């Protein structure tokens, strides 16, 4: 019974870890650097998901981070849209 953490459950733990720390901090962009948290979080879930099955690649929500940053961390979808434009324009994507 070596607990096979689901691709859901890794995302559910990571989303909770990002949101609950973000709630106490944002709009402190020193201690919650939104563009870095997006650019590394999406890259780490990309790297973790790449080698997964085309079944496990259906546990992954396409708005896994972006929903929780709005619902819980109280970041605007307008602000998130240009932080994701910056992520795609500046980063190794």
């Amino acid at each position: 019974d070596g607990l096979k953490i689901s691709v859901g459950g890794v995302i559910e733990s990571l989303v909770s870890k990002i949101s609950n720390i973000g709630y106490d901090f944002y709009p402190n962009e020193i201690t919650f650097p939104v563009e870095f948290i997006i650019n590394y979080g999406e890259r780490a879930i990309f790297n973790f998901s790449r080698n997964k099955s085309e079944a496990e690649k259906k546990e992954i929500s396409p708005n896994w981070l972006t929903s929780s940053l709005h619902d819980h961390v109280k970041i605007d979808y307008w602000i998130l849209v240009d932080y994701y434009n910056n992520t795609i324009e500046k980063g190794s994507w």
Binding site: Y23, D24, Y26, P27, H70, K74
Partner: peptide, 17 residues
């Protein structure tokens, strides 16, 4: 201690509160 974030929660309440 919560004021910084409660001044942000208010911006993502619905316009009915």
């Amino acid at each position: 201690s919560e004021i910084d974030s409660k001044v942000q929660d208010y911006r993502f309440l619905s316009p009915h509160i």
